[PDB]
Design an enzyme around this catalytic site. Structure first.
Site, short mmCIF file in Angstrom:
data_model
loop_
_atom_site.label_atom_id
_atom_site.label_comp_id
_atom_site.label_asym_id
_atom_site.label_seq_id
_atom_site.Cartn_x
_atom_site.Cartn_y
_atom_site.Cartn_z
N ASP A 1 -14.99 23.43 1.55
CA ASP A 1 -13.67 23.70 0.98
C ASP A 1 -13.36 25.22 1.17
OD1 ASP A 1 -11.23 23.42 -0.39
OD2 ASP A 1 -12.10 22.21 -1.93
N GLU B 1 -4.89 22.01 -9.06
CA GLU B 1 -6.13 22.69 -9.21
C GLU B 1 -6.19 23.23 -10.59
OE1 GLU B 1 -9.57 23.62 -6.61
OE2 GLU B 1 -8.14 24.19 -5.10
#
Ligand SMILES: OC[C@H]1O[C@@H](S[C@H]2[C@H](O)[C@@H](O)[C@H](O[C@H]3[C@H](O)[C@@H](O)[C@H](S)O[C@@H]3CO)O[C@@H]2CO)[C@H](O)[C@@H](O)[C@@H]1O
Ligand SMILES: *[C@@H]1O[C@H](CO)[C@@H](O)[C@H](O)[C@H]1NC(C)=O
Ligand SMILES: *[C@@H]1O[C@H](CO)[C@@H](O)[C@H](O)[C@H]1NC(C)=O
Ligand SMILES: *[C@@H]1O[C@H](CO)[C@@H](O)[C@H](O)[C@H]1NC(C)=O
Length: 606
Positions: free
Chosen positions: A289, A495
């Site tokens: 990521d 997020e």
């Protein structure tokens, strides 16, 4: 096999494995490490791409050639980068990745599908496959060959800011929705070996099962945190969908920022190499990521030498740097030159990267197809998104007492009706996160149809439609309305901004619902990425619909409100009575939901 200057890896008739081996055996260390490096378009230039033999580019959320850019502007950008990569000594094309997670959602004018939680409410894996198909076309419209989807997180706590990216708290539903994969990539052949990568060709994209593993299991739903659960529970809840993804030939897997029992996934050799690679037999590539390797350490980025060693030894293949490529390449080169990382590890990472590139046709079709540009926002795709939005809706209430006439479906012919609320005429709110920006935005941010516009498009010509964003009680009582449609809910997020311990919607929301419903019968449309505190809204409302984040095609909402289709959606998650209960999932010993997983009232079509 034929001219004097023949190079086996450039021969499209040869088997992929022979091409991989032929090319690998010609590469320098710098060429190899270049393949393992993915950089942001924001730091890319023709010289950087050539000189560092770069393997991949991405657009992070909102990383666009410019706002409002056409499909052809995107194709021209990607092809400019590709021309640089093709000009290297070996001419290895780059793969370009993007978060096309509910359509090609960074792009202006792309069809925006419901987010995953609403798709879970459909219990329709074939619909989700058809969405993957349409999304692949819209991604290739822009010249991009790789989508960072599906998120197969099993969100176990709705306080997580990414819960809307999860099809359900029930792994069986997430398993079912892995049909996105063969929609994006194409169906695998009859003979297929589980764990091999597959993409059918230039009209499909490479997919990515993300984020490996347990991203949905983190303590109190804290994004990127620790997932505390024994191996049996990891394997029973969070892992199963990864096996379905291997069986359908997912090309890549992205690693999670999260930890499992205190061990960072980005440094977890046992799971990345021992399990995914060696047990599931994954043969595509494993991608980090965004600054994921940096976040191995505390603080993040405080020993990048260690980050590179730990991640590459754990078995990651390609690093989403995404900015500090010179430092990444320099550090990884030094570790190999020192013997800290063996050439065997480098050669495995590069084998896997090349295997996906050759398999998907990227050496044969490295450039964009200008005839695909017209796929962006195509009406056929919008019609699909509209079907999805409508199927995703869950009817929670349709009458205050058992004896009331059901409010829904509403009549299309009435003298005057009211449409109200903060979310009735706000396309960005109805799309939520990962739309134009990562965090989403407010207002008319792309091409679509808001709830208000959908109402005006649905009703009889004699019906007067009044909009008031936040009307007071008097206004409603005096307005001569037959009924109201009031839409409220969450603001866009992703997020860690979306991690939320209270799960109460912003005001004015409840107060508008109270004012409206106090004056005229009302259907409340709740826009949210997840269950939120809902008793007060229910108490006020005649009818209430959980519409999740339905995307660009607001007519999906009015299709069910006015009875063109019946309500069929079922909760893909538990609806809690209180946040002090969380976490609380179907099957728990102490299960006391407001609405259980699977709940949904139905209507019949007019
Ligand atoms: O996008 C590639 C992979 O990225 C990572 S991190 C991803 C975050 O989830 C998202 O929240 C963040 O959004 C920030 C923008 O990058 C910033 O420019 C602005 S100022 O603020 C927003 C939100 O704070 O973007 C990151 C980069 O895309 C994901 O975890 C992966 O799922 C994604 O594939
Ligand atoms: C979890 O978040 C806490 C509180 O913010 C933080 O101090 C800790 O490092 C996090 N743990 C992990 C494993 O990410
Ligand atoms: C709920 O949490 C959010 C996100 O963390 C915060 O911004 C908001 O003010 C909170 N709402 C209440 C009523 O405290
Ligand atoms: C809807 O159709 C079902 C199945 O035929 C039927 O049993 C039920 O009575 C119907 N409800 C209404 C309002 O028509």
């Amino acid at each position: 096999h034929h001219a004097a200057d023949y190079v086996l890896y450039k021969d499209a008739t040869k088997p992929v494995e022979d091409r991989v081996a032929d090319l690998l055996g010609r590469m320098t260390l710098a060429e190899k490490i270049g393949q393992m490096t993915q950089i942001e378009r924001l730091v890319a230039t023709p010289d950087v791409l050539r000189d560092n033999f770069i393997g991949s580019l991405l657009s992070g959320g909102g990383s666009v050639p410019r706002k409002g850019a056409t499909a052809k502007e995107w194709q021209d950008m990607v092809d400019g980068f590709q021309k640089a990569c093709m000009s290297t000594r070996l001419g290895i094309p780059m793969i370009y990745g993007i978060d096309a997670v509910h359509g090609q959602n960074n792009v202006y004018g792309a069809t925006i599908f419901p987010h995953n939680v609403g798709l879970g409410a459909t219990r329709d894996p074939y619909l989700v496959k058809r969405i993957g198909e349409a999304t692949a076309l819209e991604v290739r419209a822009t010249g991009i060959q790789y989508a960072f989807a599906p998120c197969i997180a099993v969100c176990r706590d709705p306080r997580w800011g990414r819960c809307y990216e999860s099809y359900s708290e029930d792994r069986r539903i997430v398993q079912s929705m892995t049909e996105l994969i063969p929609g994006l990539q194409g169906d695998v052949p009859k003979d297929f070996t589980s764990g091999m990568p597959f993409v059918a060709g230039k009209n499909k994209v490479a997919a990515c099962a993300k984020h490996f593993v347990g991203d949905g299991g983190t303590v109190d739903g804290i994004n990127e945190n620790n997932t505390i659960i024994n191996r049996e529970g990891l394997m029973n809840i969070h892992m199963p969908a990864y096996k379905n993804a291997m069986d359908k030939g997912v090309s890549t897997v992205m690693i999670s920022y999260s930890s499992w029992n205190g061990v960072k996934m980005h440094a977890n050799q046992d799971l990345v190499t021992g399990y995914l690679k060696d047990t599931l037999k994954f043969k595509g590539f494993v991608i980090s990521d965004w600054e994921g390797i940096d976040r191995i350490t505390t603080p993040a980025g405080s020993d990048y030498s260690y980050s590179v060693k730990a991640s590459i030894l754990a078995g990651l293949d390609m690093i989403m740097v995404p900015n500090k490529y010179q430092q990444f390449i320099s550090i990884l080169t030094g570790h190999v030159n020192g013997g800290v990382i063996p050439m065997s590890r480098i050669d495995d990472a590069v084998t896997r990267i090349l295997r996906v590139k050759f398999t998907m046709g990227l050496f044969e079709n490295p450039y964009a197809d200008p005839a695909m540009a017209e796929q962006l926002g195509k009406q056929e795709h919008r019609d699909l998104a509209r079907e999805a939005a409508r199927k995703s809706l869950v009817l929670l209430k349709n009458g205050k007492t058992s004896t009331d006439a059901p409010l829904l479906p509403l009549p299309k012919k009435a003298p005057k009706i009211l449409v109200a609320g903060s979310h009735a005429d706000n396309l960005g709110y109805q799309c939520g996160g990962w739309t134009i920006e990562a965090q989403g935005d407010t207002g008319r941010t792309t091409v679509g149809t808001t709830i208000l516009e959908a109402v005006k498009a649905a009703v009889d010509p004699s019906t007067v439609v009044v909009f008031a964003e936040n009307p007071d009680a008097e206004f409603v009582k005096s307005g001569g309305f037959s009924y109201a449609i009031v839409a409220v809910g969450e603001h866009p997020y992703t997020e860690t901004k979306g991690d939320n311990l209270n799960l109460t919607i912003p005001e004015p929301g409840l107060s508008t619902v109270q004012a409206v419903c106090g004056g005229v019968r009302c259907a409340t449309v709740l826009i949210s990425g997840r269950p939120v505190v809902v008793q007060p809204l229910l108490a006020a409302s005649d009818a209430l619909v959980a519409a999740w984040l339905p995307g660009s095609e607001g007519q999906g909402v009015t299709d069910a409100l006015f009875g063109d289709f019946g309500f069929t959606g079922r909760l893909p998650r538990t609806w809690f009575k209180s946040v002090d209960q969380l976490p609380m999932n179907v099957g728990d010993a102490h299960y006391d939901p407001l609405f259980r997983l699977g709940y949904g009232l139905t209507t019949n079509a007019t």
